[PDB]
Swiss-Prot record:
GO biological process, one term: DNA replication, Okazaki fragment processing
Function recorded in the entry: Plays essential roles in DNA replication by removing the RNA primers from lagging strand fragments. Exhibits 5'to 3' exonuclease activity on either RNA/DNA or DNA/DNA duplexes and endonuclease activity on either flap or fork DNA structures.
Gene that produces this protein: rnh
Stretches assigned to coiled coil: none
Domain of life: Viruses
Enzyme Commission number(s) of this protein: 3.1.26.4
Organism this protein belongs to: Enterobacteria phage T4 (Bacteriophage T4)
CDD domains noted in UniProt: H3TH_T4-like, PIN_53EXO-like
One GO MF term: 5'-3' RNA exonuclease activity
Protein name (record): Ribonuclease H
UniProtKB keywords: DNA replication, Endonuclease, Exonuclease, Hydrolase, Nuclease
Substrates-to-products reaction catalysed: Endonucleolytic cleavage to 5'-phosphomonoester
Length: 297
C-alpha cells in the first residue's frame, strides 16, 4: 500500500436506491429496519470490492435532495421532471427517503467511512470536487458507480471506475469526453430538465403542446468543444447567454467556489468514528447476523 493511500469514492445513494427498487415491493410501507439492512448489506459488498482492488480509504458520497439542489436555486426547473415521476408511483418513496436519512446519520455516528452528506448537494458534486483534490495530492482513485458518467474527469491521472451493476470497468478517458460534455451544455440534458441553448431555459418544464427544440449542427458542438472561445463566435448572444447558464448546470469546473469549498471543508473537518462503535451499533440496531462480521466493514 502507498504513502498517499488509494481512495475509493462510492456513488452510494444510487447503488442503494437501485437495490431498493428491486428488493422492496410496491404498495408496502418501507420502514427503518428494511432500509438499514439494505444499506449495510450494500456497504459490506462494495467495501470488500474496494479493499481487494487495493483502496483502503472509503468515502461514501450521498445524494441529499431533502431541500432540493443548489443547482435548482440557480435554475428553478432543474430536475423537476424527476419529482413529478415519484408523485404518481405506488412505491413508498416517502418512507424510503425518511428512513435513508436516519440511516445516513447512523453511518456518520458509528461507521468508519467519510460520509459526504450535505442537504442540497449531489453525490456527483462530492465526487467531482474530491477527485480534483485527491488527484492533485497524488492519491490513486477508485470511483464505484454503476452508471455514473465521470468522463469529465478524464484529465486527472490514476482515476478508475468500477460498475457494480454491470460488473465491469467504466471508461473515464473516453476519447470524446469534451465533445460529450459540450453536447449536454449546448443541446441540453432532458433527463435533468436541462434545455438546449436555442430555447428558453425552463423549456422542459414549461413546454406547450406542439413546441419543438430547433436543431443544432454537430459541427458547432465539435467546434466549441475543441475551442470554447468559439462560443462567442458561433452562437448568437441569446444562445451564448444560455450557454453560460448551462455551464453551471453541467460542467464540474463551474461548481461555484462556495459550494466546492463547503465540500472540501466538510471532508477536512469530518469526525471519523473509532472502529469500536461498529459493534455497539450493530447490537443496538439488532443486526445480530452482522456482529459476526465486524471485520468486513
Ligand atoms: Na462516519
Amino acid at each position: 500500500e502507498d504513502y498517499k493511500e488509494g481512495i475509493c469514492l462510492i456513488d452510494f445513494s444510487q447503488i442503494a436506491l437501485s437495490t431498493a427498487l428491486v428488493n422492496f415491493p410496491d404498495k408496502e410501507k418501507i420502514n427503518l429496519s428494511m432500509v438499514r439492512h439494505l444499506i449495510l448489506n450494500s456497504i459490506k459488498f462494495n467495501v470488500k470490492k474496494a479493499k481487494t482492488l487495493g483502496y483502503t480509504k472509503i468515502v461514501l458520497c450521498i445524494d441529499n435532495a431533502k431541500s432540493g439542489y443548489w443547482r435548482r436555486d440557480f435554475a428553478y426547473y432543474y430536475k423537476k421532471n424527476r419529482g413529478k415521476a415519484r408523485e404518481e408511483s405506488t412505491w413508498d418513496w416517502e418512507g424510503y427517503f425518511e428512513s435513508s436519512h436516519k440511516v445516513i446519520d447512523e453511518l456518520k455516528a458509528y461507521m468508519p467511512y467519510i460520509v459526504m452528506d450535505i442537504d442540497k448537494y449531489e453525490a456527483d458534486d462530492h465526487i467531482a470536487v474530491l477527485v480534483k483534490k485527491f488527484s492533485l495530492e497524488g492519491h490513486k482513485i477508485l470511483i464505484i458507480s454503476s452508471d455514473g458518467d465521470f468522463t469529465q474527469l478524464h484529465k486527472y491521472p490514476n482515476v478508475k471506475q468500477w460498475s457494480p451493476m454491470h460488473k465491469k470497468w467504466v471508461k473515464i478517458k473516453s476519447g470524446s469526453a469534451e465533445i460529450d460534455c459540450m453536447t449536454k451544455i449546448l443541446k441540453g440534458d432532458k433527463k435533468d430538465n436541462v434545455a438546449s441553448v436555442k430555447v428558453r431555459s425552463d423549456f422542459w418544464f414549461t413546454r406547450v403542446e406542439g413546441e419543438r427544440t430547433p436543431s443544432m449542427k454537430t459541427s458547432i458542438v465539435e467546434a466549441i468543444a475543441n475551442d470554447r472561445e468559439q462560443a462567442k463566435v458561433l452562437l448568437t448572444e441569446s444562445e451564448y447567454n444560455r450557454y453560460k447558464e448551462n455551464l453551471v448546470l453541467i460542467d464540474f469546473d463551474y461548481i461555484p467556489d462556495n459550494i466546492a469549498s463547503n465540500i472540501v471543508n466538510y471532508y477536512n473537518s469530518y469526525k471519523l468514528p473509532p472502529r469500536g462503535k461498529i459493534y455497539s451499533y450493530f447490537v443496538k440496531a439488532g443486526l445480530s447476523k452482522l456482529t459476526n462480521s465486524i471485520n468486513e466493514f
